[PDB]
């Protein structure tokens, strides 16, 4: 299947409680593999997946140096953004950035990403052509002109088309026993009476990887989109994910309802019914 690598930066100011905290985490697909935290006793980029541990000391030194430099520059960026919005020194603010590459089964670049948000609001994004930016407002226009003068887009294009996909390909091979292994959901339907007239049918998917999954209820083969309660896909803690979908059915009519499950780990899609 297709794959992605993403890094997530978060910088958080906290006036009166020290300098802004800087966090970086890296993912391949839905597997976290590195973390950096400027609040740590000895800040270093650290492994969070077994297949990255084999990288040598020059790898960990480079990622740590970049992240320590980022701690300083994202603190300056937070000061800059505060001024762009005429904001006081007393409030706490958040700067977030996420970037990375998507590749297809041949490992070729499908598209690159770099976008930033300030206090949860989209701020600036590298366009899909990897050559220009979309600035959300007149503050982000200042950043855009800075980055244009520094030739930033050309640096991003070179990373996203080059080292990003090269490192992702290496990670996929080093971690192929997990990163390239799709674990199918274990599925079942439970039944929960509400009253004499109604009951809940809940269709469960457990233990699956990656997190992408489709869970739907049909009644007489018609999708019950508006009437299905879908919880957010949630982590189990063992790399796998869980999800369920629920519908309220008239008592006695349970057999008109079917649960349909799609996942990359499944040879063929699944149709499930309440067993009784």
């Amino acid at each position: 299947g297709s794959h992605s690598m993403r890094y997530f930066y978060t910088a958080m100011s906290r006036p009166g409680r020290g300098e802004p905290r800087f966090i970086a985490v890296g993912y391949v697909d839905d597997t976290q593999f590195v973390r950096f935290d400027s609040d740590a006793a000895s800040p270093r980029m650290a492994p969070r997946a077994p297949w990255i541990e084999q990288e040598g000391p020059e790898y960990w030194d480079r990622e740590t140096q970049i992240s320590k430099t980022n701690t300083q520059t994202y603190r300056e960026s937070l000061r800059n953004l505060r001024g762009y919005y005429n904001q006081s020194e007393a409030g706490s603010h958040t700067l977030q950035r996420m970037y990375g590459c998507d590749v297809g089964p041949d490992g070729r670049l499908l598209r690159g990403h770099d976008q930033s948000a300030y206090d949860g609001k989209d701020y600036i994004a590298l366009n899909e052509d990897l050559s220009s930016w979309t600035a959300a407002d007149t503050a982000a226009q200042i950043t855009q002109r800075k980055w244009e003068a520094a030739r930033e887009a050309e640096q991003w294009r070179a990373y996203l088309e080059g080292l990003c996909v090269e490192w992702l390909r290496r990670y996929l091979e080093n971690g192929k026993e997990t990163l390239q292994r799709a674990d199918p959901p274990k599925t079942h339907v439970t039944h929960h009476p509400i009253s004499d007239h109604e009951a809940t049918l809940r269709c469960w998917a457990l233990g699956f990887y990656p997190a992408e999954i489709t869970l739907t209820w049909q009644r007489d083969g018609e999708d019950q989109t508006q009437d299905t309660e879908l919880v957010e896909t949630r982590p189990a803690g063992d790399r796998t994910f869980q999800k369920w979908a629920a519908v309220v059915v008239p008592s006695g009519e349970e057999q008109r309802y079917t649960c349909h499950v799609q996942h990359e780990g499944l040879p063929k899609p699944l149709t499930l019914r309440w067993g009784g």
Partner: peptide, 9 residues
């Protein structure tokens, strides 16, 4: 692996 250290916003 990370892109090189960022320049300021």
């Amino acid at each position: 692996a990370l892109i090189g250290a960022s320049i300021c916003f």
